[PDB]
Design a protein around this ligand. Structure first.
Ligand SMILES: CC(C)c1ccc(COc2ccc(CC(=O)NCCN)cc2Cl)cc1
Ligand SMILES: CCNC(=O)CN(C(=O)c1ccc(O)cc1O)c1ccc(OC)cc1
Ligand SMILES: [Mg+2]
Length: 336
């Protein structure tokens, strides 16, 4: 097979970061999505794949890793078939959309799969702080790559099967997403614990004090983040107040500045000591048999961040930082 040489060739290129604007203005035809994607997906696949091969042999050769490696190889090849094929012919384009579907689905399990490699590495070689920085280093990169691949694939399959533009909403009402996520967390909350804290939203539109706040974002990404955060702050809030009678609400503030859109979630769940805050964002230190770390990646993906500050004995604030303007929302992609 050619697999290694394909990887060699396409890993000389660099992934091409797109902006939400550049995403938005796409439909400027499938032909163009097609010809773009058949080059770029191979690039992004190759780049992470060569980085996977920089992993030391004791990691490199466990079942978990070798398993995802096989998936990425089959994908690269699945996409290969379409290099000499041409557009104008509408079955080329249709067979492609189908190929993009199969790939996305094949990869639905990378998270639990990799997570398994961390566990067998913990039990096999130790949980030292160095291993931890490499695992952290490698996975932050690996997942992020992975997210952007999905982003491309979803932009294609959804548009070339209007208010929305695929996975993007150009009029994303943030509190709308905040509540939905809240409502879903509460449901799970009311089931397991049969109590649940309330929600207070407040907006602060700096430039336009009385205007409801809208942005251009990918709302499922935003849902995902807010969801984990609500889960966590509910869980804490309940268990911290099980001998008490009052259950403190979860206050969220959504704030819009000249370049930031920022979302704080404040809970009175009894806090976490400074010492333990790193552990929460660590893939290794929070592995037992998404979480915060993956939700963070989503934040980073379009030049955002997601941060935590607690006060032990009281509560935790968690902040989602997003870029306010489509121009600033460029993809953050790892490169080899
Ligand atoms: C399966 C995935 C999650 C996984 C699980 C476990 C690991 C562990 O990765 C390590 C551990 C130790 C070292 C030191 C070393 O030998 N350095 C040599 C070069 N200085 C490097 C790496 Cl990349 C990575 C990825
Ligand atoms: C006594 C109850 N105490 C907590 O459960 C502490 N707890 C926090 O305080 C906390 C942490 C993260 C967060 O975004 C919000 C929080 O309130 C916490 C919540 C979720 C979590 O998942 C692993 C770990 C810790
Ligand atoms: Mg932090």
């Amino acid at each position: 097979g050619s697999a290694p040489k394909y990887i060699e060739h396409f890993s000389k290129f660099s992934p091409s970061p797109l902006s939400m604007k550049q995403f938005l203005d796409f439909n400027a035809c499938e032909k163009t999505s097609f010809t773009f994607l058949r080059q770029e997906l191979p690039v992004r696949l190759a780049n992470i794949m060569k980085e996977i091969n920089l992993l030391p042999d004791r990691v490199l050769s466990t079942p978990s890793v070798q398993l995802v490696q096989s998936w990425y190889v089959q994908s690269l090849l699945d996409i290969m078939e379409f290099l000499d094929k041409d557009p104008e012919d509408h079955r080329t384009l249709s067979q492609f959309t189908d190929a993009l579907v199969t790939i996305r689905n094949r990869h639905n399990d990378v998270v639990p799969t990799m997570a398994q490699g961390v566990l067998e590495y913990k039990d096999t070689y130790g949980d030292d702080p160095v291993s931890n920085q490499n695992i952290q280093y490698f996975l932050d990169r690996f997942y992020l790559s992975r997210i952007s691949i999905r982003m491309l694939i979803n932009q294609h399959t959804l548009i070339f099967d209007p208010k929305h533009i695929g996975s993007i909403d150009p009029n994303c009402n943030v509190s709308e997403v905040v509540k939905d996520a809240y409502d879903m967390a509460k449901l799970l909350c009311d089931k397991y614990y049969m109590a649940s804290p309330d929600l207070e939203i407040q907006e602060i539109n700096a430039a336009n004090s009385k205007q409801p706040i809208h942005m251009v974002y990918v709302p499922s990404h935003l849902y995902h983040m807010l969801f984990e955060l609500f889960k966590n702050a509910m869980r804490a809030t309940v268990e911290s107040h099980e001998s008490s009678l009052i259950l403190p609400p979860i206050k969220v503030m959504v704030a819009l500045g000249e370049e930031d859109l920022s979302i704080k979630m404040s809970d009175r769940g009894g806090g976490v000591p400074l010492r333990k805050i790193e552990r929460l964002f660590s893939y290794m230190y929070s592995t037992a048999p998404y979480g915060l770390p993956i939700s963070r990646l989503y934040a980073k993906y379009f030049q955002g961040d997601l941060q935590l500050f607690s006060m032990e004995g009281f509560g935790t604030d968690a902040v989602i930082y997003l870029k306010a303007l489509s121009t600033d929302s460029v993809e953050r992609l790892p490169v080899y």
